[PDB]
Structure 1
Amino acid sequence: MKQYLELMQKVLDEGTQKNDRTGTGTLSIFGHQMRFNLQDGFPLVTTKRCHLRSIIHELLWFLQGDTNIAYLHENNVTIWDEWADENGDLGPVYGKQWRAWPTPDGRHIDQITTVLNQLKNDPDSRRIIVSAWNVGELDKMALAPCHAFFQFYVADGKLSCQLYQRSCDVFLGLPFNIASYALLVHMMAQQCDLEVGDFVWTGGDTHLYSNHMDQTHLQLSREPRPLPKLIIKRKPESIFDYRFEDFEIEGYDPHPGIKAPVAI
């Protein structure tokens, strides 16, 4: 997509060298923002083929509050394999915090349920937020949340979402992250009888891994294509009742997929 490729090019051009957690090294910038008007099309990158399969199942998995990879495996999704323990557990990552954020008194908070009720009852609220950044549970997580903090907003019958992504693997992660949140906006909009607005993406440490440079030059050599259209085929009873088969992407015409190794 134009803004995605612009970001890639910017990291290449302006990023500074970082030694990082993984020992791989990156080129990195700090602070970026992009805006995707979801009525212009579904923001699935077209300069490499992205598999919506993994994106969809990961999102449904988050929504069901699951942090064990068994569900993902049932659906042939292997994207979380490198960080799961012997029992397939990741600890209290994304899903757990979205659906069951724990408090010291032993209670749990369902942020997604809160958000739906906020959108339906108080759409003008400036407090329609989900955080995965549960400081007190970081030490138990396989990875600290990358897509850490997000907000919804409603105007003129349209639902927008902004994500604060503290850490972004521009090549591997970002295409997924953008599509995932765009999908979520479509789902919540449907449940709330709203139209879709913008997805606003904000990055913190926004980087290209040193071992993704060939892949980056290959992708940058490619021109984007018009965005596909998301079709939701069935409206379920609640935001927690979607299934993979509910979603179709029409008019997705990508360039070929590009393979690159993940930094562990």
Structure 2
Amino acid sequence: MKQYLELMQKVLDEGTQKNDRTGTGTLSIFGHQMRFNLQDGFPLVTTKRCHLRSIIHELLWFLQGDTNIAYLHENNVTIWDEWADENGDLGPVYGKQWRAWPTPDGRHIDQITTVLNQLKNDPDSRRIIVSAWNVGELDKMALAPCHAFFQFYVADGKLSCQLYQRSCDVFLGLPFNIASYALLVHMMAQQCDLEVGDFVWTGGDTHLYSNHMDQTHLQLSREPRPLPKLIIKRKPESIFDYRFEDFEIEGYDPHPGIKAPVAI
């Protein structure tokens, strides 16, 4: 997509060479923001085929408050398998924090239910936030939230969302995070009777692994095509009742998929 490709080039052009944890080396920039008008179409990359299916399951796994890759294996999403323990557990990652943040004093806050209720009762609120960055439980997580903090906003009947992404694998994960967050805005907007506004993506350490270069070069030379359109086939009774069959993508005609190694 235009915004995506320009960020990729921007990493190539100004990225600083860093030695990372994995000892693979990255090309990195710090602080970037991009905006997606969701009224223009679903922000699914067309320069490399992406599977809306793995996107939708990882999203519904989070809203359910699940931290076990079982549901994810059974639906062929496997990215998370190298991070789980022998039981399939990740610790209190995303899903746990969104649905049950543990208070220092034995209770749990359900941040999606709060957000829903604020969108329905107090849309002007400047505090419609979801944080996965639970300082207190970071050491128990297999991986510290990458997509860590997000805020909603309504202006004239439209729901916008801004995400803060502390660390971003530009080639592999970015396509995934943009579609997932676009999808949630779509689902939050239907449950709440709002129109879709913009998806604002803000990044911290935004990088390209030194081993995604040929594949990045390959991608930068394809012509982005018209964005697809999302269809939500049924309006479930709650934000929690969605299912895969409920979503469809019209006019998605990507360039063939591009394979690349995951850095572990």
What number of residue pairs does the alignment pair up? 264
State how 1:3-82 maps to structure 2 within 5 Å.
3-82=3-82
Residues 219-228 or 72-81, more deviating? 72-81
- Distance in structure 1 (CA, Å) of the matches to 2:185 and 2:169: 22
> How far did 1:107 drift?
1.0
Secondary structure of the residue aligned to 1:80 is helix
**CA root-mean-square deviation:** 0.5
Q: Corresponding residue for 2:153? A: 153
- TM-score normalised to structure 2 length: 0.99
Runs of 4+ in 1 over 2 A off after TM superposition: none
* CA deviation map 1:91-120 (0-9, x unaligned): 000000000011111111100000000000
Separation in 2, partners of 1:151, 1:215: 33
Higher deviation after alignment, 69-78 or 107-116: 69-78
Whether the 8 Å contact between 1:157 and 1:195 is mirrored in structure 2 is: yes
Residues 175-216 of structure 1: CA distance to partner in whole angstroms, max 9, x if unpaired?
000000000000000000000000000000000001101110
Offset at residue 74 of structure 1 (A): 1.5
1:234 shift after superposition: 0.4
Q: CA deviation at 1:22?
A: 1.3
Deviation at 1:128, TM superposition (A): 0.1
CA contact (8 A) 1:188 1:239 kept: yes
Write out per-residue CA displacement over residues 122-157 of structure 1, whole angstroms, 9 at most, x where no aligned residue.
Answer: 000000000000000000000100000000000110
| Cα distance in structure 2, aligned partners of 1:112 and 1:106 | 19
Cα contact 1:2–1:224 (8 A) shared by 2: yes
Which one is further off, 232-241 or 78-87? Answer: 78-87
- Can you list the C-alpha shifts for 1:218-253, whole angstroms capped at 9, x where unaligned? 000111000000000000001000000000000001
- What is the deviation of 1:10? 0.3
Distance 1:154 1:21 in 2: 39
- 1:240 and 1:214 map into 2 onto residues whose CA distance is 40
Partner of 1:257 in structure 2? Answer: 257
Instruction: Assess if the C-alpha contact under 8 Å between 1:234 and 1:246 holds in 2.
Output: yes
Q: Report the secondary structure of 2:212's partner residue.
A: helix
What residue in structure 1 maps to residue 239 of structure 2? 239
Identity of aligned residues (%): 100
Query: How far apart, in 2, do the equivalents of 1:158 and 1:149 lie?
Result: 20
Counterpart CA distance in 2 for 1:51 and 1:80 is 16
**In structure 2, C-alpha distance between the alignment counterparts of 1:223 and 1:106, rounded to whole Å:** 53
Q: Deviations over 1:10-41 (max 9, x none)?
A: 00010000111111110000000000000000
Hey, what's the Cα distance between the residues in 1 that align with 2:108 and 2:168? 29
- Asked if the contact 1:54/1:79 (under 8 Å) is kept, the reply is no
Per the alignment, in what secondary structure is the counterpart of residue 172 of structure 2? coil
Separation in structure 2 between the aligned mates of residue 38 and residue 122 of structure 1, nearest angstrom: 22
Instruction: For 2:77 and 2:176, locate their aligned partners in 1 and report how far apart those are by CA, in whole Å.
Output: 13
Measured in 2, the distance between the counterparts of 1:259 and 1:82 equals 18
Partner SS for 1:241 = coil
For the residues of structure 2 that align with 1:85 and 1:157, how far apart are their CA atoms?
Answer: 44
Shifted more, 133-142 versus 69-78: the winner is: 69-78
Structure 2 residues not aligned, in runs of 5+: none
CA distance in 2, matches of 1:80, 1:187: 24
Q: Distance in 2 between matches of 1:107 and 1:199?
A: 32
CA contact (8 A) 1:168 1:174 kept: yes
What runs of 5+ residues in structure 1 fail to find an aligned partner? none
1:170, distance to aligned residue in structure 2 (A): 0.3
Deviations 1:160-187 (A, max 9, x none): 0000000000000100000000000000
